């Protein structure tokens, strides 16, 4: 075990690489593309 009307995110092998897919998603924006302009 590693870390934590509930949920539990538990790492059995105690490595960050040994975890499954990373489902926690924040970063995004299309604008790096589709609008890559100064002004």
């Amino acid at each position: 075990g590693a870390q934590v009307i509930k949920y539990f995110n538990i790492n059995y092998y105690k490595d960050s690489a040994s975890s499954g897919l990373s489902r926690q998603d924040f970063s995004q924006d299309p604008s790096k593309f589709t609008q890559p302009l100064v002004d």
Binding site: D15, A17, D25, F33, L37
Partner: protein, 263 residues
């Protein structure tokens, strides 16, 4: 998870700033939505792109390689260059940082050893080779019946990402052995296989799942079948035999149509 935006209502509009006009030259995509063009209704839209994010898109554990045990021995140099379908998906991007979990699907039976041989040293070249006796080379013993072996390799870069494409060389200008592309840029190790029994079949399938992926510089998807690995060469030489010697095929996926305007 992020749902796609709702469709907002829009009525008739008389506007002296057209949103449907623009310039393709500026290098920007259109901002136009259906609210600019037609007259729309409010639609409550719960659809998600969650299955299109780079984690789900590249996270399915494709087959990277196949090897055959010859005299109860096999060897594979870890890479995605050999399989066209997974190689095309990685090459939507210039740079990838990922851990990989490696599952070994074998039809053999009895007992197998996998040795992960880190770069820079010599691997066992046969079964019964003394190099299968290793203090520090990580190995896996498994019995193919009752379970598939799986291990995770973390990200071994030398850099902050893997190069999918590399426009440089590993040696200076005048060197005649120069190598072009990503092959010098990193080596992920090799997997050695041997059987400690005889038993079942000789086939060893290596399935690899990228996980914890970070992708960087989107590229045009591969428009042509691959020819060689670590190349980008798309010209295919079908035969060495005779007068068709030195005739090359591109082998693209574009299909024609009889007429424009009649489709």
């Amino acid at each position: 998870v992020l749902v796609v935006p709702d469709t907002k209502p829009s009525g008739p509009q008389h506007t002296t700033k057209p949103s449907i006009l623009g310039a393709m030259e500026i290098g920007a995509s259109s901002n136009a939505t259906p609210e600019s063009t037609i007259e729309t209704r409010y639609v409550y839209n719960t659809n998600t792109n969650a299955e299109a994010d780079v984690e789900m898109f590249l996270g399915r554990s494709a087959l990277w390689g196949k090897v055959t045990l010859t005299r109860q021995y096999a060897k594979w140099e870890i890479n995605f260059q050999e399989q066209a379908h997974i190689r095309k998906k990685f090459e939507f991007f210039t740079y990838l940082r990922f851990d990989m979990e490696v599952t070994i699907v074998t039809n053999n039976k009895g007992l197998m050893q996998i040795m992960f041989v880190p770069p820079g040293i010599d691997h066992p070249e046969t079964h019964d080779d003394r190099k299968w006796d290793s203090a520090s080379n990580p190995s896996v013993f498994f019995q193919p019946k009752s379970g598939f072996p799986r291990f995770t390799i973390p990200f071994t870069g030398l850099a902050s990402a893997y190069y999918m494409f590399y426009d440089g060389y590993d040696k200076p200008k005048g060197s005649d052995n120069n190598e072009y592309g990503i092959a010098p840029t990193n080596d992920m190790g090799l997997l050695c296989f041997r059987t400690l029994d005889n038993s079942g079949g000789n086939d060893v399938k290596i399935y690899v799942k990228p996980k914890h992926i970070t992708a960087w510089v989107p590229r045009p998807p591969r428009a042509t079948q691959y020819t060689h690995k670590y190349s980008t060469n798309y010209h295919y030489k079908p035969n060495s035999s005779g007068p068709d010697e030195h005739v090359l095929k591109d082998r693209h996926f574009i299909k024609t149509r009889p007429l424009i305007s009649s489709a």
